[PDB]
Amino acid sequence: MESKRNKPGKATGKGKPVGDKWLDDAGKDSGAPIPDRIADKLRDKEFKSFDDFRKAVWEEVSKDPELSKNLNPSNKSSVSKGYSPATPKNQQVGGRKVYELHHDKPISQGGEVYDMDNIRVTTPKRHIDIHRGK
Amino acid sequence: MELKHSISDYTEAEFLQLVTTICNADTSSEEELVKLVTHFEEMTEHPSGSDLIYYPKEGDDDSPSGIVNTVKQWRAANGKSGFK
Is A130's Cβ below 8 Å from some Cβ in B? Predict the structure, then answer.
């Protein structure tokens, strides 16, 4: 095996319309989708790794007034740097304190790495709850 | 492994610099930032943890000096040690 998430690829997909409270949905259901306006900015661009794509997502969040309006000043500083914003304490898991990008269909089962319709934004807690039920 | 960080090893000035680094995200990496947030939580001992920085209560001042004052007052109210 060689890891697909560590190889370059091309972002694809549509995302979904979300509201200014999108990150609240990250702690529910299968998490939040990639916002359509973020998909619109990243679609067809090449990224060096999934981590590079993840930085680009949070950079794009920082640039979008509606998707960043709910962040407080400290979280706005984080996303301005391409860092993931901190979740509420009650959604953290140990040293996992920030929103996570996860693949809905696992890459090992045919899911694509940079397919934005296959990526969900979750809190650490919601991710672990999902994983534990598998 | 790393022993608990203690707030009484910091002066108020030093603690204000640390909080400002967090609020500005003035770090080399996200990992370094989350390490500082963890250390902040260990030092304050405040049950709200990183929420003091990112999810302040309505009415709280979430500027760096605001957060430092909230921590100082809470520690005072709860019989804990203050700054160096």
Answer: no
Query: Is A86 in Cβ contact with B53 (below 8 Å)?
Result: yes
Q: Show the domain range for B25.
A: 1-84
Of B25, B48, B50, the CB nearest to A97: B50
CATH topology of domain A1-134: 3.90.540
Rounded-to-integer distance, Cα A116 and Cα B33, Å: 27
Resolution in A: 1.6
Write down the experimental method used for this entry. Answer: X-ray
CB of A62 within 8 Å of a chain B CB? The answer is: no
How many whole angstroms separate alpha carbon A11 and alpha carbon A41?
Answer: 10
Q: Which of A78, A72, A73 is nearest to A57 (CA)?
A: A78
Angle separating helix axes B12-24 and B64-77, nearest 10 degrees = 130
